[PDB]
Swiss-Prot record, chain A:
Component of the ribosome, a large ribonucleoprotein complex responsible for the synthesis of proteins in the cell. The small ribosomal subunit (SSU) binds messenger RNAs (mRNAs) and translates the encoded message by selecting cognate aminoacyl-transfer RNA (tRNA) molecules. The large subunit (LSU) contains the ribosomal catalytic site termed the peptidyl transferase center (PTC), which catalyzes the formation of peptide bonds, thereby polymerizing the amino acids delivered by tRNAs into a polypeptide chain. Component of the large ribosomal subunit (LSU). Mature yeast ribosomes consist of a small (40S) and a large (60S) subunit. The 40S small subunit contains 1 molecule of ribosomal RNA (18S rRNA) and 33 different proteins (encoded by 57 genes). The large 60S subunit contains 3 rRNA molecules (25S, 5.8S and 5S rRNA) and 46 different proteins (encoded by 81 genes). It is found in: Cytoplasm. It comes from Saccharomyces cerevisiae (strain ATCC 204508 / S288c). There is a cross-link at K17 (Glycyl lysine isopeptide (Lys-Gly) (interchain with G-Cter in ubiquitin)). This is Large ribosomal subunit protein eL40A.
Swiss-Prot record, chain B:
Signal peptide: none annotated. GO terms for molecular function: rRNA binding; structural constituent of ribosome. Its main location: cytoplasm. It comes from Saccharomyces cerevisiae (strain ATCC 204508 / S288c). The gene is RPL9A. It is found in: Cytoplasm. The lineage of its organism: Eukaryota, Fungi, Dikarya, Ascomycota, Saccharomycotina. Present with 52400 molecules/cell in log phase SD medium. This is Large ribosomal subunit protein uL6A. Keywords: Cytoplasm, Ribonucleoprotein, Ribosomal protein. Component of the ribosome, a large ribonucleoprotein complex responsible for the synthesis of proteins in the cell. The small ribosomal subunit (SSU) binds messenger RNAs (mRNAs) and translates the encoded message by selecting cognate aminoacyl-transfer RNA (tRNA) molecules. The large subunit (LSU) contains the ribosomal catalytic site termed the peptidyl transferase center (PTC), which catalyzes the formation of peptide bonds, thereby polymerizing the amino acids delivered by tRNAs into a polypeptide chain.
UniProtKB/Swiss-Prot annotation, chain C:
It is found in: Cytoplasm. Component of the large ribosomal subunit (LSU). Mature yeast ribosomes consist of a small (40S) and a large (60S) subunit. The 40S small subunit contains 1 molecule of ribosomal RNA (18S rRNA) and 33 different proteins (encoded by 57 genes). The large 60S subunit contains 3 rRNA molecules (25S, 5.8S and 5S rRNA) and 46 different proteins (encoded by 81 genes). The modification N6,N6-dimethyllysine is found at K105, K109. GO terms for biological process: cytoplasmic translation. There are 2 genes for uL14 in yeast. It comes from Saccharomyces cerevisiae (strain ATCC 204508 / S288c). The keyword Zinc-finger does not apply. CDD domains: Ribosomal_uL14. Methylated by RKM1 at 2 different sites, but it is unclear which are the 2 methylated residues among Lys-39, Lys-105 and/or Lys-109. GO terms for molecular function: large ribosomal subunit rRNA binding; structural constituent of ribosome. This is Large ribosomal subunit protein uL14A. Component of the ribosome, a large ribonucleoprotein complex responsible for the synthesis of proteins in the cell. The small ribosomal subunit (SSU) binds messenger RNAs (mRNAs) and translates the encoded message by selecting cognate aminoacyl-transfer RNA (tRNA) molecules. The large subunit (LSU) contains the ribosomal catalytic site termed the peptidyl transferase center (PTC), which catalyzes the formation of peptide bonds, thereby polymerizing the amino acids delivered by tRNAs into a polypeptide chain.
Amino acid sequence: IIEPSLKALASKYNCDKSVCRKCYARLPPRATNCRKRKCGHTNQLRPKKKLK
Amino acid sequence: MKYIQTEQQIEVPEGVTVSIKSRIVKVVGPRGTLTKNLKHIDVTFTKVNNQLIKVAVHNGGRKHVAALRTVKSLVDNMITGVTKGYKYKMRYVYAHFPINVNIVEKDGAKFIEVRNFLGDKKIRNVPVRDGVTIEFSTNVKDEIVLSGNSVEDVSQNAADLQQICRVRNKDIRKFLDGIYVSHKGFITEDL
Amino acid sequence: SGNGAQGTKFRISLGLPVGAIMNCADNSGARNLYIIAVKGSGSRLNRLPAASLGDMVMATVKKGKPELRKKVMPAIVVRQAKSWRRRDGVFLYFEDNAGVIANPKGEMKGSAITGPVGKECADLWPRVASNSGVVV
RNA sequence: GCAGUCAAGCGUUCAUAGCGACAUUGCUUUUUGAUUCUUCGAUGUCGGCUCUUCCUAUCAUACCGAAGCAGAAUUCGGUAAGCGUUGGAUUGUUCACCCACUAAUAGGGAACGUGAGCUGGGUUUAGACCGUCGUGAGACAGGUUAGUUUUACCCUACUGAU
RNA sequence: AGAACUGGCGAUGCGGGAUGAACCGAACGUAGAGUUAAGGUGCCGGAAUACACGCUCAUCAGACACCACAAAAGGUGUUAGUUCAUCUAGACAGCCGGACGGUGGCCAUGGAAGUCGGAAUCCGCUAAGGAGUGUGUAACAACUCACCGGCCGAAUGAACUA
């Protein structure tokens, strides 16, 4: 028992994110470049996988 | 290219008073006094009249202008902080384990106490940052609400309580249990 | 120590280096056992793994019925024969080494344990209390 | 040996969780070679025992992030070398596959670290056998046995003492 | 390792390249004075922390040949340009609504008319708003969405080249 009013908001703080391919850096959804200076600011991304 | 000079406008409602000497910025309002030091960022203030006060940068570069802008947004966020006020509505999120939040005086320093988090045997504790009083909302079950003056006070202490609830080495997309800042309000009922 | 044995074992002297031959305490049919390696011991350069009372030590079989031989098996040492010291100040030691064939969980492949038994290896494996002979 | 770039496919559906061919750019010296620049008026040459130290391209632990992560177990990666990386049968062994314990049993050098530190099993002399080659003397990473391993009282470095 | 036209080094000093025979300038009897080459002009070193225009901040900067290292690929990091586009009759954002209809042209026919779809497309009312996009359910009624656009009041977006 969670319910969306208690749930879908958590996706925004967990399951709604983007991830850089090389450094696996968590990123806000529309970010077009990883911020990390170790990875080289590469633009490549993947959407963080939803459950099932 | 050094854009020659630019400026922004700060505006003051009737009952609040800025006082800027050197780069030190005092603010006085219905919510009390706020103080901030911008001296690191190197800008020039122009006062035409009260409600109109213009900030300017001369002969600066891209980054320096980019700093002027956020100086505007900062001080203005203080002003509208001292009229409205800052309030964060956070709602508890728990699945099988209800989370206890006490307020405890320990050496008079106002520690927020968190117990029974994930049914764990550990005690959790966070210091309350200065100036922010905390309430528990009426007729909303499992809500905690923060009230304070500057954005850094409310925001920083709030978010800190947010990140005291991280889950350790479990799934972060299955267990959703935690405390989350949801709605960012202003203290006064109207605004 | 080891996984599957409840209880906090206080430390005792090290009486059985690798190769030592304990004598079997029960129906196993092996006149005597043979150690190989010990559960839980540490590693140090050119240091044989120690063994002692209450230890759970691997073992093989040099004598007796064939089905015991040529297979590693868990075993437990219930008589050290090297004097150790309980916290209460006594030094007590038996007159020979001894051991019992057992499962990983403390059950006995044996029946009764002949000869006296040190209790430090009894109460540490609560199962063996009922299969026990004279204790202490 | 290690590290990338791109990506057809495999991966349920699905280039990118993880794989990763097709090619493709590099790094390292730890093998093995090429060169032979330096030493035949001799830098004592394998491995083991011993003993510190160092580099990480970290195996485990601290802290985290992804997962085709429910939990568990495990995989991929980052900050990190701070500490820890074994006990045994056979081998002269480097190496190796082996049984077990293991938090895990990672990789490497430091004139293939260290012979006025040892051993000296091996290889390398003189003895000896056998197989093959040689008409014979003899030869062989062959296979086997037998084979003196010196000096410190010098300066320096250090450990201690005035 | 091997050759060709020169020049050096061996048989050659001096200043500079921190240091080094073959690199740069220069080929020395011994003194004096003067002016220059190469190189330098923070301090160690004698000499301008002299002038000018700029560009770069790097939680592994760079620093001037032979001389003693680096690439392929990325980066709205930043700066400068090129070509396309778009423009205060009003942009791009970010709020406020709405997108009407002829006709569900025509077809799957069990019904979706834009949309479990299509071989494929004209008209009417708008200073606007599509036989036309998801919510919707085999369809249908509601808006999403270019747009009138009210607010907003100006240049911006894309690709690259460096």
